[PDB]
Amino acid sequence: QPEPDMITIFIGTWNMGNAPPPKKITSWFLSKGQGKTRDDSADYIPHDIYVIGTQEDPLSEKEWLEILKHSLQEITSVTFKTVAIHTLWNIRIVVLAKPEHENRISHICTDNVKTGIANTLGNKGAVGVSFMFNGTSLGFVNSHLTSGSEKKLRRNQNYMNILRFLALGDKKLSPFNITHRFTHLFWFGDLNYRVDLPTWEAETIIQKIKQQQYADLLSHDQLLTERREQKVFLHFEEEEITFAPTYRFERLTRDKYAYTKQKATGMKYNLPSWCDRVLWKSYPLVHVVCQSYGSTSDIMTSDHSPVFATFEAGVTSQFVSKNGPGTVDSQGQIEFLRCYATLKTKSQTKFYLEFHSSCLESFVKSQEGENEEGSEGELVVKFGETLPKLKPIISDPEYLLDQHILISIKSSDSDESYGEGCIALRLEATETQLPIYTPLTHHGELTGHFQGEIKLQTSQ
Numbered sequence: 001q002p003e004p005d006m007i008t009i010f011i012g013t014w015n016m017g018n019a020p021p022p023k024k025i026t027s028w029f030l031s032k033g034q035g036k037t038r039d040d041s042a043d044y045i046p047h048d049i050y051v052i053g054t055q056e057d058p059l060s061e062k063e064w065l066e067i068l069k070h071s072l073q074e075i076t077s078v079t080f081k082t083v084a085i086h087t088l089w090n091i092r093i094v095v096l097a098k099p100e101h102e103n104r105i106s107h108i109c110t111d112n113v114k115t116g117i118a119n120t121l122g123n124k125g126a127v128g129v130s131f132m133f134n135g136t137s138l139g140f141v142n143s144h145l146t147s148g149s150e151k152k153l154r155r156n157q158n159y160m161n162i163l164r165f166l167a168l169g170d171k172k173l174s175p176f177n178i179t180h181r182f183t184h185l186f187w188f189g190d191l192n193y194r195v196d197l198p199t200w201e202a203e204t205i206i207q208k209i210k211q212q213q214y215a216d217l218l219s220h221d222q223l224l225t226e227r228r229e230q231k232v233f234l235h236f237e238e239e240e241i242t243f244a245p246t247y248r249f250e251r252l253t254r255d256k257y258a259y260t261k262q263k264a265t266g267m268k269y270n271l272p273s274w275c276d277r278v279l280w281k282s283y284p285l286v287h288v289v290c291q292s293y294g295s296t297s298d299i300m301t302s303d304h305s306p307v308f309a310t311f312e313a314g315v316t317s318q319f320v321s322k323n324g325p326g327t328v329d330s331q332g333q334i335e336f337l338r339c340y341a342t343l344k345t346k347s348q349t350k351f352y353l354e355f356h357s358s359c360l361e362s363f364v365k366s367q368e369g370e371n372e373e374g375s376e377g378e379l380v381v382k383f384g385e386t387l388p389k390l391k392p393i394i395s396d397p398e399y400l401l402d403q404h405i406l407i408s409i410k411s412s413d414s415d416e417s418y419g420e421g422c423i424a425l426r427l428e429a430t431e432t433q434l435p436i437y438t439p440l441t442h443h444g445e446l447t448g449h450f451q452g453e454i455k456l457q458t459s460q
Ligand SMILES: Fc1ccccc1NCc1cc[nH]n1
Pocket: 218, 219, 220, 221, 223, 224, 225, 227, 228
């Protein structure tokens, strides 16, 4: 039985509004309703992995797992295996996989982050799951961020706390946060960003939704505008939104948005908004294609509609050669020529690099770079031709060209990372000097750039 080079992944996010679900929720897992929906001809084809994020979930883990498994079995006839389940308060993530994947999945991690302080600590935060699928690392984050139209900055802060403190994936990747630890990272949930239009325009917005005219609403969506201004979710992707706002509905219909201020809302307006979202970030030049992104129309127990997204995702096999794992393959090498980091820092420490990759036996520390002043104020750290030659465990180009090198630039004085990035080895040529580039981030904010040339030697 061949190992796959693609899988499909289902991502669901649903704020259940503290109410039990209806008896049938199959439309969610079938990607049917509004938006980019899945073709009927695929309905019996199971996804490889289903990742379900809930918020305001009133069920026990047992109760929800029974509903989810029975739903998938009804659709597909397949009895899915439970990979992981993790709950923080009423925020939950479930990962289910086809039984044939059970011996492909390993290194399962779970964690949570509680956001806020005192007043604002006790119900918002995130849960996550990571694991290896053969040679490919997968991370999943379900976050319930701060509510309210006038709290976009708090949401952005919540995002930065979650990506700093959620402890998933390979702990040896110590300079790297979750935005660099995974081949594919999916971040979803009740992100709670709102359509920023005046309260007086509520009925106009409702009109627009009834006409399926979302352009003048999406142009005011806080997540899209904050992302455009590089305030949040830097280097993440989101599929175009083609479904109606998923909040805030009257329960038991989808015919009415309930936006007016009430004691139950803290006297806040809830204008129709795309609270419920799926974003992703994959390593450079890895296959990832969104094949659905939409909301259900027929699940009406909550004041939110469920959101689905599905993806094709490239995966790699657990490679064995005569040599690596457990030695190097001297027919393989990675050279960095004429490299330099450009940093936004005002500091004047010396810097060194660390190169981290599962194609290396362990991470590699460089010599200190040479600091120069850039024309427009910046720090330029030059490495010249001084960088250590990297010795991969396997030289086979079918393996090596699919790998990635994580780079951290660290202060000699403090050993703290000032920036992290990633270089693909999916080159146009081997034995050829080729340009490389990554932005550098720290705590998910832009801190600089790394650029230079690479020369990759494979066994071919
Ligand atoms: F979210 C982004 C990342 C990169 C470039 C652009 C965007 N959003 C554009 C937008 C703003 C309001 N509606 N659409």
